[PDB]
């Protein structure tokens, strides 16, 4: 009639991905955490573009949509910024947005590769991932001699449910019960299937015996970040986001219980 006492054991931590294991928790909590990593973790991304000149072979919507998908470093800034819906300013203020600028013209005969390096931001904390001091720069558009691309973009705070550009993950390898002990799957020919990296069984065996009193535990994870948020910041921001959603829901709930009379 109460909560569980989950534990954590990290098996790999890098700047690109983090591999951890959660034990003593329900499958629902593990799946919701997985869903939050993709859809309810705030991040900064371009959401407003004003093309002042574009003589390239790619139309404006093609460039705007491209720019939106460029990841921006948002480790400590996303917690400080606010959503445009709640902000009491107008236009695009510094507290609810980050202004960007691009001014490129191909004067030489060689093809000019407009890259993310050319995106100049007003805040040094929010910059393209590739620009952060190996990895090459993201390619926006190629220009021919005489062509021009000049715009003024604005980044905003958002999450995955609004658009995939606001997804900080590049893959979430969620796995549980590597050896099919709970028999949640039924392999018609278990000998024809490969072994998971987290499996603990001899090669002579195909799957663990069935466990009737078994429950889903020891959920494995691999959160590969796009680069914007460090792999650990995604998990912390996720748990904090889901806990905020439940806190707000509890508030609205109490307001409805009290409103009854």
Residue positions in the annotated binding site for Zn(2+)? 87, 89-91, 93-94, 96
Q: Which is nearer to other proteins, 19 or 98 (CB)?
A: 19
177, 192, 206, 211, 221 from 188: Cα distances, Å: 18, 9, 12, 18, 27
Give the contacts of 90 (CB within 8 A, at least 6 positions apart). Answer: none
Written as one string, the DSSP assignment of 142-157 is EE-TT-EEEE--EEEE
Instruction: Give me the least distance between CB of 125 and other proteins, in Å please.
Output: 20
Pick one of other proteins, Zn ion, none as the site partner of residue 258 (Cβ within 5 to 8 A by kind).
none
Residue ranges of the annotated binding site are: 87, 89-91, 93-94, 96
Pick one of other proteins, Zn ion, none as the site partner of residue 202 (Cβ within 5 to 8 A by kind).
none
Instruction: Give me the least distance between CB of 16 and Zn ion, in Å please.
Output: 14
Instruction: Give me the least distance between CB of 91 and Zn ion, in Å please.
Output: 8
Instruction: Give me the least distance between CB of 218 and Zn ion, in Å please.
Output: 27
Output the CA torsion sign for 124, 127, 130, 132: positive
Instruction: Give me the least distance between CB of 169 and Zn ion, in Å please.
Output: 11
Q: DSSP character for 134?
A: -
Q: How far apart are CA 68 and CA 193, in angstroms?
A: 40
Q: Which is nearer to Zn ion, 36 or 96 (CB)?
A: 96
Token code pair at residue 143: 């220009």
Q: Which is nearer to other proteins, 68 or 202 (CB)?
A: 68
At 173, give phi and psi (nearest 5°).
-80, 90
Q: Which is nearer to other proteins, 135 or 202 (CB)?
A: 135
Q: Which is nearer to other proteins, 103 or 145 (CB)?
A: 145
Pick one of Zn ion, other proteins, none as the site partner of residue 206 (Cβ within 5 to 8 A by kind).
none
Q: DSSP character for 8?
A: E
What does the binding site for Zn ion look like in residue numbers (CB under 5 A)?
87, 89, 93, 95-96
Contact, 256 vs 249, CB < 8 A? no
């Amino acid at each position: 009639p109460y909560a569980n006492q989950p534990t954590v054991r990290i098996t790999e931590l890098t700047d690109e991905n983090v591999k951890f294991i959660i034990e003593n928790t329900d499958l629902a909590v593990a799946n919701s955490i997985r869903r939050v990593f993709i859809a309810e973790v705030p991040i900064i991304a371009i959401d407003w573009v004003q093309i002042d000149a574009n003589s390239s072979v790619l139309h404006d919507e093609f460039i705007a949509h491209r720019l939106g998908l460029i990841p921006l470093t948002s480790d400590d800034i996303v917690d400080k910024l606010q959503y445009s819906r709640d902000c009491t300013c107008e236009e695009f203020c510094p507290e609810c947005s980050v202004e960007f600028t691009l001014d490129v013209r191909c004067n030489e005969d060689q093809t000019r590769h407009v890259t993310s390096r050319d995106l100049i931001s007003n805040s040094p904390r929010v910059i393209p991932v590739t620009s952060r001091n190996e990895q090459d720069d993201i390619l926006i558009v190629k220009l021919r001699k005489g062509q021009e691309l000049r715009l003024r973009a604005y980044a905003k705070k958002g999450f995955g449910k609004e658009h995939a550009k606001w997804n900080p993950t590049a893959g979430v390898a969620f796995e549980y019960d590597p050896d099919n002990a709970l028999r949640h799957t039924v392999y018609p020919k278990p000998e024809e299937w490969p072994k998971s990296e987290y499996s603990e069984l001899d090669e002579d065996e195909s799957q663990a015996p069935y466990d009737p009193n078994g429950k889903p535990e020891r959920f494995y994870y691999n959160v590969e970040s796009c680069g914007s948020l460090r792999p650990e910041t995604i998990v912390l921001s996720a748990l904090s986001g889901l806990k905020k959603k439940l806190s707000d829901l509890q508030t609205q709930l109490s307001h409805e219980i009290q409103s009854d009379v």
